[PDB]
Amino acid sequence: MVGLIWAQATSGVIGRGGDIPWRLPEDQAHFREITMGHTIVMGRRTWDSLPAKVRPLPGRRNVVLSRQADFMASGAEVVGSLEEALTSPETWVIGGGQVYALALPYATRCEVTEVDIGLPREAGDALAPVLDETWRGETGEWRFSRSGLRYRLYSYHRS
């Protein structure tokens, strides 16, 4: 099984300036809950985007895609392709616009957090992948963060 998990603004924006344009602790919790104890796959840029104190992501087998051969990611496995990175029976892809798009054709689950912030898609934005008609979605209800950010959860699966 290969799962994708991400948090996006309604517009599909997941990242800008090498960072995420919001803070939603409830989403961190969700991300942590789902990926804990599993293999995670992330782009080199996601790795670099991780605050120092949560890299490698504790409690998960960290795998980082990079084309750079000298690239070292302390406490993670650096690999040069998705197919070397998808070796584990249940891998969560957590890891970058570029990487969701590579990983998409292999995935059978997605966990999406939608954050209710108006943020136009911009050139350079890391963006969420589009799920075509092969996918079946379950949409959760809007909630309010302790921080007043409205957000909701979607779960997607397919044959």
Ligand X SMILES: COc1cc(NCc2ccc3[nH+]c(N)nc(N)c3c2C)cc(OC)c1OC
Question: Annotated binding site for substrate: which residue ranges?
Answer: 5-7, 27, 32, 60, 100, 113
Task: Confirm or reject binding of residue 125 to ligand X (CB under 6 A).
Answer: no
From residue 57 to residue 96, the character string flagging contacts with ligand NDP as x (rule: CB under 6 A) and all else as - is --------xxxx--x--------xx------------xxx
Instruction: Tell which one of 2, 41, 43, 49 touches ligand X (CB under 6 A).
Output: 49
Q: Residue 18: which region, alpha, beta or left (left: phi > 0; alpha: psi -120 to 50)? A: left
Instruction: Tell which one of 6, 22, 47, 151 touches ligand X (CB under 6 A).
Output: 6
Nearer to ligand X, 20 or 127 (CB): 20
| Residue 129's binding partner out of ligand NDP, ligand X, none, with CB under 5 to 8 Å set by partner kind | none
Task: Confirm or reject binding of residue 115 to ligand X (CB under 6 A).
Answer: no
Token output for 127: 């963006």
Strand 13-15 relative to strand 126-127: parallel, antiparallel, unpaired? antiparallel
Query: Where in 23-42 is the site for ligand NDP (CB under 6 A)?
Result: 42
Residues in binding contact with ligand X, number by CB under 6 A: 16
Token output for 57: 């992501």
In this chain, which stretch among 25-33, 70-78, 83-91, 133-141 interacts with ligand X, using CB under 6 A? 25-33
* Secondary structure (DSSP) of the chain: -EEEEEEEETTSEEEBTTB-S---HHHHHHHHHHHTTSEEEEEHHHHHHS-GGGSSPTTSEEEEE-S-TT---TTSEEESSHHHHT-SSSEEEEE-HHHHHHHGGG-SEEEEEEE-------TT-EEPPPP-TT-EEEEPPPEE-TTS-EEEEEEEE--
Chain residues binding ligand NDP by CB under 6 A are: 6-7, 14-15, 18-20, 42-46, 49, 65-68, 71, 80-81, 94-99, 102, 126
